[PDB]
Amino acid sequence: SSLSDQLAQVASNNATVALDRKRRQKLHSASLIYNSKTAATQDYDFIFENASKALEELSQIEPKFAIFSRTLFSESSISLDRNVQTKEEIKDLDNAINAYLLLASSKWYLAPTLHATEWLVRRFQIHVKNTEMLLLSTLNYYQTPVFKRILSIIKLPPLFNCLSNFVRSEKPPTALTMIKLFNDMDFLKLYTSYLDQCIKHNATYTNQLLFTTCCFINVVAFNSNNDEKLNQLVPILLEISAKLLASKSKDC
Amino acid sequence: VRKLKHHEQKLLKKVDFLEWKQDQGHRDTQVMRTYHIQNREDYHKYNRICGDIRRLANKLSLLPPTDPFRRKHEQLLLDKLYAMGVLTTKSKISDLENKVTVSAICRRRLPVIMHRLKMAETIQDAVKFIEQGHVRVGPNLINDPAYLVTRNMEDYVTWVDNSKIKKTL
Amino acid sequence: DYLLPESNGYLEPENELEKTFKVQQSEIKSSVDVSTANKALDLSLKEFGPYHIKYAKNGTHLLITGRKGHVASMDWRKGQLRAELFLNETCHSATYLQNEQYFAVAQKKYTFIYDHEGTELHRLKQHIEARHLDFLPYHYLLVTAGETGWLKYHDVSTGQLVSELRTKAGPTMAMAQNPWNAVMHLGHSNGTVSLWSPSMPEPLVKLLSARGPVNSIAIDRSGYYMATTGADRSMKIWDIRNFKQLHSVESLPTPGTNVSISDTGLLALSRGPHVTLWKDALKLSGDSKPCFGSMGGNPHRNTPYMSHLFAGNKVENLGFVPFEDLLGVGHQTGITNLIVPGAGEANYDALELNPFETKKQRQEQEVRTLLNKLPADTITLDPNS
Amino acid sequence: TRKFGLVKRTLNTKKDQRLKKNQEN
Amino acid sequence: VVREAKKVEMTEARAYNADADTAKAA
Amino acid sequence: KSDFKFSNLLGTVYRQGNITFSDDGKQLLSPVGNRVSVFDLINNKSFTFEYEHRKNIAAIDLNKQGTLLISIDEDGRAILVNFKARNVLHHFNFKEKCSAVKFSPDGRLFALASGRFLQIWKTPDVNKDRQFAPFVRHRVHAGHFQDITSLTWSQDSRFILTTSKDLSAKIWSVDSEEKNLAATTFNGHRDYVMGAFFSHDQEKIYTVSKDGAVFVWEFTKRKYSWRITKKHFFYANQAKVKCVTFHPATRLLAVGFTSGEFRLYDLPDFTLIQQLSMGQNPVNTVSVNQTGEWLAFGSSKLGQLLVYEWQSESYILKQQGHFDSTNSLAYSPDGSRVVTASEDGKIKVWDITSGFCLATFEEHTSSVTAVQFAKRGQVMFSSSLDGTV
Amino acid sequence: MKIKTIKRSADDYVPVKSTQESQMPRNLNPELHPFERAREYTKALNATK
Amino acid sequence: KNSKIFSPFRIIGNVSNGVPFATGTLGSTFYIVTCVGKTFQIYDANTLHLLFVSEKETPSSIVALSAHFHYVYAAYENKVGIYKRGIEEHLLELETDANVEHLCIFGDYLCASTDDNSIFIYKKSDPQDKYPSEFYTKLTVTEIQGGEIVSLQHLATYLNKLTVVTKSNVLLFNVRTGKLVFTSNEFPDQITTAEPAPVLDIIALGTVTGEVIMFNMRKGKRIRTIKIPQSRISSLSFRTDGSSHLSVGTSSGDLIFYDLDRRSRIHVLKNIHRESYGGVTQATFLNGQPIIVTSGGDNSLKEYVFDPSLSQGSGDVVVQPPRYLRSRGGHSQPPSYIAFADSQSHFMLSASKDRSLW
Amino acid sequence: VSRNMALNGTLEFLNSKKMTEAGSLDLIDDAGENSDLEDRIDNSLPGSQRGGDLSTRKMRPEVRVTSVQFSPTANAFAAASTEGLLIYSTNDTILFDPFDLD
RNA sequence: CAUUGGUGAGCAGCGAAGGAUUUGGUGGAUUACUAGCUAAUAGCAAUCUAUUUCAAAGAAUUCAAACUUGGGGGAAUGCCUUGUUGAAUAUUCUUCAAGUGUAACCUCCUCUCAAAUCAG
Structure with missing residues (x-):
């Protein structure tokens, strides 16, 4: 490789570890509601108090979000940054974050969800540190400007590469971009790994699920000619159909 | 580096990081600017000979005046340095210390020569044309931009044949 | 003493059956925290020559110099890279003089002083050879020992030569500057390291360090113990405070190319395909004599603390990050940062050096240091005299 | 794909604002 | 999707030594 | 009438690499820019092989009996040549830069100094047909720290010692059961040990270094092993060695100094026979025969070769070619004569078979450009940039 | 085989708020502070000048 | 039968034949x-x-x-x-x-x-x-x-x-x-191909039916089975790199890649080696590397790699299909006509009934 | 005339593994790493074409052949090259051939 | 009218389940192929560590050691050299001069061009 690409790879290894103070005022200043001049001057405790202030209403809506008060929204869970942890601890952090994401995927029209996950964005860099679950849990909300804000904040993975023109855009991402996002093959292996994750965890709600079928169906719409591409598309859809029917759920 | 204070200035009386006396005013670079030489050491490849001119020009001025070797050897110096064209005149002896600059030997460089003859628009475009392999000095196409070309070789620089830039003119 | 907020990392055997040195760097990279495990770099830049390494005194910028054309100043922790120069002359060493904005490279002929962007600031008419190019920021003095007998001191604050000292020793085979004392240490083929101040034209004291030529030398943070290696497969542990070699490690399998000293007391010995560091080896007892193999697991005999073997290389030089627990080993294809547990100090003093420094903090601190430079006559055998 | 006349870019005495003779304008 | 081949170096690993399996006579 | 094949290259008498005589003192092997020329001294003829190397030659030897020729590049291209047959037998590629190839006095196996590695290979067989991979590496000895710069066998094949730019000069055997008989190393010098040697009796060891030093190693007492009985310094002041050989059966050191000087010694005595200023230009290679009455120098500052006797003050050939400066070439009406001009001014006169400048004319001061023959090859002229013909 | 390293933790030394001033950890260990006579001397000479 | 003028040197132009x-x-x-x-x-x-x-x-x-x-x-x-x-x-x-x-x-x-x-x-x-x-x-x-x-x-x-x-x-x-x-x-079934395993006790067997059996000996039991519709298996291999992956090489030329944890095929390579010349004759993962070296009876020897996984969040689920790496080939059929191409005896043209030059 | 990498205009196609990021891999000045002081000394004036000495081109030597002539008798042609005088001939089977060697 | 200009329509014409273009990535060659690592006759390659350490061998220009300096001046203050003075015990060091002495240290040069513009 070149030196410059071998060193810009180390940017990807430490995109969240703020070393200079300008890296902090880049890394802390992006969040889900607050403008970056007011988002620059936020103490951690002040954001966590708003986090609990939305999290208590969320836990009172359904009790399953009460456990993240025990671990993620603990008052002891402020000072700990991710990069100070071992990767075996980081895996359990990502487990908590992921299981929270498919959980809050239903509740995302609520400003409680927007005020709850914004702290998780700011305390655990989940726009960057775990962005595949951030996007896959919140993929169906492509018309909503909360997600459109989220697009301007997420370090885009290669798997979600249709929206490389839509980060920091005015108009929302169109319906055809959902098909072109899904028209890839390995994206569909990610969406199996999302939906199969939601099946065993039984966190499968209707609106996102209708978006799933509308995207998968439009994929086979787009593959009406490419019969060889269709013949490698049977393993991804019929597995989702089979593992979907193992649900107790009737919408699934 | 700092637009430092009235109280900072008097304590840091002699310091500088930009123009040093060992760095000799960055004078060489102003010749590396005006003639666009690739490596730095081309300057000091002229300036190591340039004093060597004066180091012979000085001690031939220390001989007795009508020493019949002295006026002959100085003529042999001056016809040589006039064949290479590094001085404009040859009648006076005083050019051997006053006209022998790095810029004067460096305006006998090849793209300076083509830049005089207006085959090229600027200097660096002639350097680009030598790099592209468009130019030749009589028989030989030259690849090197840093060609010392004498006064008598100066008629021999043409464009090379069958090119795309000789058909451009 | 209790204000000291951060404590060192350790490495513990946990059994006599389990061994300390047998840990490998992929095995280390499991348990180290993610930023610190990721701070190990693998820069294989195999096209140019073997690579020379220097971190700045704060770890914020790495400077590397391949033997063929490479000159590279990265803002190492982040993705930023300041300088990338390809001079077709061959180079030997490089150091940042004051900050990452200004550095100096040791070429075939002339030292060069350079901008952060890669521009040319100052070519030195003098320094006609440059083998070891080292700095002391407390005098703003770039001290350079080439293949010449001489030794040159350039005061880059003023930008002028201070002095030039002919050793009558020949080509300089090693040079390590003292952090605590700013006395320079030159090592030559007789087995002789000379201590140096720019004033005294004869050396402060000559030391018949070993037999054969001096491979390298490296000095403590405290300036107490300087670890010298000859090419005679031997390494002496000099205690400079009373001018005694504490231990004489004889018959290495191969003579160490370099030696390096961490802050907390680690010693790095690089025979070139192998890098081996000892913990607390510089202490007074011969129980603390660094030894390769302790038979029977005796606590008196001392084993190496951390080991590594480079497969396809013979490494050039090495230097710890001064505030972190890694060391950059420059190999033929590039750079590894080998993760130590307790090499660097955990609690830096910000008012001495700033590993976390704003550019405005930097231009404040640079002017602070230039006010507090010492003129060159103050380089002495004791700081306090 | 490298541009021709790869020259040593160095200190411009007429353009570098770090010079105090060009500290005015 | 950026489907590009990356440069893939051989990294070292470890395998079982099948030549260590025999015990001699009693 | 169409088919023209390469016959012979002439001149540019030394560029880079090792010089050697054969078993007999007739055949002298020199490198050319990439080829090997052979000059036969008594039967005065010259020859250059039909092949060329791909880079400049940095290592050369021929067989014991004159059957195999090994040329090795700077990079380590190795070319096996049927020396008697002038045809290439094998192109091996050594991947390191090697400095010395020496055949056995046995002729059974050769060895190679590449890096800190010694590689000891069996000889390929000449009367056998050419194979795909003829070379069999017998052993590899890597007990050295820096690049191995010089190397010799004993007069028996059973002992080989090599010397590096590292301080060490180390002996081993061919066979490992002869390891325990003698396997040790030598140290205690100052510098690049530039040549270490066996004496003609295999009990005395001479080790010579770059600084100007020789040690006389001997398996002697204070079991007991291998002390220095004496040292020897020529006391060259700033000058230092470049090349050194030792003819053992007459106990003779040939030295080459950086100042172009050269000395001769008688090694149990260490007595200066004569000092010759070979020139300003250093001896880049020394060589002796097995008879040891001719010496061969090459200055790669000029590009000259010099065969001179040590005992009688007498040269054999003092050849000094000029690279890039072969301006004119002229066949006579006779097919026995050839004229080469130059930019240095020398105009040489060659026989086609016996490739020697029989005549020269060093009377032009500048470049000689064009030369034609006339009147049955009697008269031969030389127009010049020297302002004359 | 207990493996423990140094961790700056990237939050203690670089603060959360942009308006917050830097944290300044000091170690008055004399090995970190090489010149207690000479640097104080130059400060005194600066003050007198 | 012996020649006097010439002698055999090597048979230039061959990489493999099909022998495992x-x-x-x-x-x-x-x-x-x-x-x-x-x-x-x-x-x-x-x-x-x-x-x-x-x-x-x-x-x-x-x-x-x-x-x-x-x-x-x-x-x-x-x-x-x-x-x-x-x-x-x-x-x-x-x-x-x-x-x-x-x-x-x-x-x-x-x-x-x-x-x-x-x-x-x-x-x-x-x-x-x-x-x-x-x-x-x-x-x-x-x-x-x-x-x-x-x-x-x-x-x-x-x-x-x-x-x-x-x-x-x-x-x-x-x-x-x-x-x-x-x-x-x-x-x-008729067992046709064996392979040891980087797990303990398991021998993998690919039979004359499209069936691979993982078999224990401390159990003596066939722990898992793997089906293939209508293909005769020739080679088995295990990717010991860091994700458990299994290589099934047919004699139809096809290479099938399984992840036994997801219980799913990953990608099947088609026609990396010629079916008439033995199909895929032998494919083997290099131990602890994501590189599989395949060898056919068409005088060809290919290499393939798994690219490292694109899914940062998942990893093991989203798998890049195997991708062509370096290969030494030969003429699959015997060569019909040859000639010496250059003057210095460096290159030889060889054309076969494989319908190609080399 | 000659197949030499150190001779400059020998190769038709250059090996792209030597074409680095900025520059050739061989155009880097490697004379500065010699152990000897004299070989580390550079005396090369910049733009010397076929001038006095070899070291002062600051280049590899160009493969050039200056002078060309035929023999009268056996149609042999000799050309004085950069490497030196080469001889081609029709005096075939002067290649010496030992027979039946022990 | 030649358009010998292309657009633009078209058509003859070519023409097997598309044609034409543009580019990213990677692999292969771009010198003639004898395996990797190490402390190397051997061991490794799941490992060299609780035989790697004892042992031997191992120390000159009695201090040769800028082969490297843009050129002139000078070279105050330094250094060098001898002249010369004191002290200590045949040598360092105090003191002092003479040096078209000097790669320290001060200045002058090593920029102003038939390049172009511009009044006349």
């Missing part, structure tokens, strides 16, 4: 030993540069190839070559006139099977010694014990236990003693 090649390691790096009739070839895996060739043409064609670290074991008709660097260091001529079918190396032993359903055992003369030269014994497989011997493998951590698999079943021997320590029951 062997893999070996020098330190960290890999070499590949393939067969071409009576002459074997050695390759670096990281460039497919040719490393060694046989010192001699063998008098009959090589039937089997195994390879330990510095010693490559060829097996032609009755005799077995112990080769260092392609040079015949020790010929081990078996005490039958039966033809050597298969071969394996473990411990101080060598084990090679013949077509008389009898395996020969060759001890080292010492564990201090490196190549096996002492003849130990001959054990056999009678038709109550097993069928025709398909492979001999040694699964790891099995002290002197020899795993001889047939078309029918699996046997285990103490080759110090010579006693059958265990016989497996018959699998109802």
Whole structure:
């Protein structure tokens, strides 16, 4: 490789570890509601108090979000940054974050969800540190400007590469971009790994699920000619159909 | 580096990081600017000979005046340095210390020569044309931009044949 | 003493059956925290020559110099890279003089002083050879020992030569500057390291360090113990405070190319395909004599603390990050940062050096240091005299 | 794909604002 | 999707030594 | 009438690499820019092989009996040549830069100094047909720290010692059961040990270094092993060695100094026979025969070769070619004569078979450009940039 | 085989708020502070000048 | 038959033939030993540069190839070559006139099977010694014990236990003693390909049906099965890199990649080797590397890699399909017309009924 | 005339592994790493074409052949090259061939 | 009218389940192939560590050691050299001069061009 690409790879290894103070005022200043001049001057405790202030209403809506008060929204869970942890601890952090994401995927029209996950964005860099679950849990909300804000904040993975023109855009991402996002093959292996994750965890709600079928169906719409591409598309859809029917759920 | 204070200035009386006396005013670079030489050491490849001119020009001025070797050897110096064209005149002896600059030997460089003859628009475009392999000095196409070309070789620089830039003119 | 907020990392055997040195760097990279495990770099830049390494005194910028054309100043922790120069002359060493904005490279002929962007600031008419190019920021003095007998001191604050000292020793085979004392240490083929101040034209004291030529030398943070290696497969542990070699490690399998000293007391010995560091080896007892193999697991005999073997290389030089627990080993294809547990100090003093420094903090601190430079006559055998 | 006349870019005495003779304008 | 081949170096690993399996006579 | 094949290259008498005589003192092997020329001294003829190397030659030897020729590049291209047959037998590629190839006095196996590695290979067989991979590496000895710069066998094949730019000069055997008989190393010098040697009796060891030093190693007492009985310094002041050989059966050191000087010694005595200023230009290679009455120098500052006797003050050939400066070439009406001009001014006169400048004319001061023959090859002229013909 | 390293933790030394001033950890260990006579001397000479 | 003017030098232009090649390691790096009739070839895996060739043409064609670290074991008709660097260091001529079918190396032993359903055992003369030269014994497989011997493998951590698999079943021997320590029951299909495993106790078997069986011996049980519709399996391999992946090589030329944790095929490669010339003859993952070296009967030897996984969040689920890497090919059919191309005897054009130049 | 890498205009196609990021891999000044002081000394004036000495081109030597002539008798042609005088001939089978060697 | 200009329509014409273009990535060659690592006759390659350490061998220009400096001046203050003075015990060091002495240290040069513009 070149030196410059071998060193810009180390940017990807430490995109969240703020070393200079300008890296902090880049890394802390992006969040889900607050403008970056007011988002620059936020103490951690002040954001966590708003986090609990939305999290208590969320836990009172359904009790399953009460456990993240025990671990993620603990008052002891402020000072700990991710990069100070071992990767075996980081895996359990990502487990908590992921299981929270498919959980809050239903509740995302609520400003409680927007005020709850914004702290998780700011305390655990989940726009960057775990962005595949951030996007896959919140993929169906492509018309909503909360997600459109989220697009301007997420370090885009290669798997979600249709929206490389839509980060920091005015108009929302169109319906055809959902098909072109899904028209890839390995994206569909990610969406199996999302939906199969939601099946065993039984966190499968209707609106996102209708978006799933509308995207998968439009994929086979787009593959009406490419019969060889269709013949490698049977393993991804019929597995989702089979593992979907193992649900107790009737919408699934 | 700092637009430092009235109280900072008097304590840091002699310091500088930009123009040093060992760095000799960055004078060489102003010749590396005006003639666009690739490596730095081309300057000091002229300036190591340039004093060597004066180091012979000085001690031939220390001989007795009508020493019949002295006026002959100085003529042999001056016809040589006039064949290479590094001085404009040859009648006076005083050019051997006053006209022998790095810029004067460096305006006998090849793209300076083509830049005089207006085959090229600027200097660096002639350097680009030598790099592209468009130019030749009589028989030989030259690849090197840093060609010392004498006064008598100066008629021999043409464009090379069958090119795309000789058909451009 | 209790204000000291951060404590060192350790490495513990946990059994006599389990061994300390047998840990490998992929095995280390499991348990180290993610930023610190990721701070190990693998820069294989195999096209140019073997690579020379220097971190700045704060770890914020790495400077590397391949033997063929490479000159590279990265803002190492982040993705930023300041300088990338390809001079077709061959180079030997490089150091940042004051900050990452200004550095100096040791070429075939002339030292060069350079901008952060890669521009040319100052070519030195003098320094006609440059083998070891080292700095002391407390005098703003770039001290350079080439293949010449001489030794040159350039005061880059003023930008002028201070002095030039002919050793009558020949080509300089090693040079390590003292952090605590700013006395320079030159090592030559007789087995002789000379201590140096720019004033005294004869050396402060000559030391018949070993037999054969001096491979390298490296000095403590405290300036107490300087670890010298000859090419005679031997390494002496000099205690400079009373001018005694504490231990004489004889018959290495191969003579160490370099030696390096961490802050907390680690010693790095690089025979070139192998890098081996000892913990607390510089202490007074011969129980603390660094030894390769302790038979029977005796606590008196001392084993190496951390080991590594480079497969396809013979490494050039090495230097710890001064505030972190890694060391950059420059190999033929590039750079590894080998993760130590307790090499660097955990609690830096910000008012001495700033590993976390704003550019405005930097231009404040640079002017602070230039006010507090010492003129060159103050380089002495004791700081306090 | 490298541009021709790869020259040593160095200190411009007429353009570098770090010079105090060009500290005015 | 950026489907590009990356440069893939051989990294070292470890395998079982099948030549260590025999015990001699009693 | 169409088919023209390469016959012979002439001149540019030394560029880079090792010089050697054969078993007999007739055949002298020199490198050319990439080829090997052979000059036969008594039967005065010259020859250059039909092949060329791909880079400049940095290592050369021929067989014991004159059957195999090994040329090795700077990079380590190795070319096996049927020396008697002038045809290439094998192109091996050594991947390191090697400095010395020496055949056995046995002729059974050769060895190679590449890096800190010694590689000891069996000889390929000449009367056998050419194979795909003829070379069999017998052993590899890597007990050295820096690049191995010089190397010799004993007069028996059973002992080989090599010397590096590292301080060490180390002996081993061919066979490992002869390891325990003698396997040790030598140290205690100052510098690049530039040549270490066996004496003609295999009990005395001479080790010579770059600084100007020789040690006389001997398996002697204070079991007991291998002390220095004496040292020897020529006391060259700033000058230092470049090349050194030792003819053992007459106990003779040939030295080459950086100042172009050269000395001769008688090694149990260490007595200066004569000092010759070979020139300003250093001896880049020394060589002796097995008879040891001719010496061969090459200055790669000029590009000259010099065969001179040590005992009688007498040269054999003092050849000094000029690279890039072969301006004119002229066949006579006779097919026995050839004229080469130059930019240095020398105009040489060659026989086609016996490739020697029989005549020269060093009377032009500048470049000689064009030369034609006339009147049955009697008269031969030389127009010049020297302002004359 | 207990493996423990140094961790700056990237939050203690670089603060959360942009308006917050830097944290300044000091170690008055004399090995970190090489010149207690000479640097104080130059400060005194600066003050007198 | 001997020529006086010319002599054979090598048969230029061959990479492999279809005989199941062997893999070996020098330190960290890999070499590949393939067969071409009576002459074997050695390759670096990281460039497919040719490393060694046989010192001699063998008098009959090589039937089997195994390879330990510095010693490559060829097996032609009755005799077995112990080769260092392609040079015949020790010929081990078996005490039958039966033809050597298969071969394996473990411990101080060598084990090679013949077509008389009898395996020969060759001890080292010492564990201090490196190549096996002492003849130990001959054990056999009678038709109550097993069928025709398909492979001999040694699964790891099995002290002197020899795993001889047939078309029918699996046997285990103490080759110090010579006693059958265990016989497996018959699998109802015709077993065609064996492979050991980076998990303990498991031998993978690909039968004449499209079925791969993971089989224990401490259990003696067939733990999992894997189906393939209508393909005859030829080679099995395990990716020991860091995700559990299985390689199924057909004789139809197709290479099928499984992840046994997801219980799913990953990608099936089609037609990496010619079906008429044996299909995929042998494919093997380089141990602890994401590189599989495949070898066909079309004089071709390819390399393929798994790219590292694109899913940062998942990893193991989203798998890049295998991707073409370097290959040395030859003419699949014999060459119809050749010529000498250049003047310096560097290049030769060779055109075949494979319908290509080379 | 000659097949030499160190001779400059020998190769038709250059090996792209030597074409680095900025520059050739061989155009880097490697004379500065010699052990000897004299070989580390550079005296090369910049733009010397076929001037006085070899070291002062600051280049590889160009493969050039200056002078060309035929023999009268056996149609042999000799050309004085950069490497030196080469001889081609029709005096075939002067290649010496030992027979039946022990 | 030549358009010998292309757009633009078209058509003859070519023409097997598309044609034409543009580019990213990677692999292969771009010198003639003998395996990787190490402390190397051997061991490794799952490992060299609780045989790697004892042992031997191992120390000159009695201090040769800028082969490297743009050129002139000078070279105050330094250094060098001898002249010369004191002290200590045949040598360092105090003191002092003479040096078209000096790669320290001060200045002058090593920029102003038939390049172009511009009044006349």
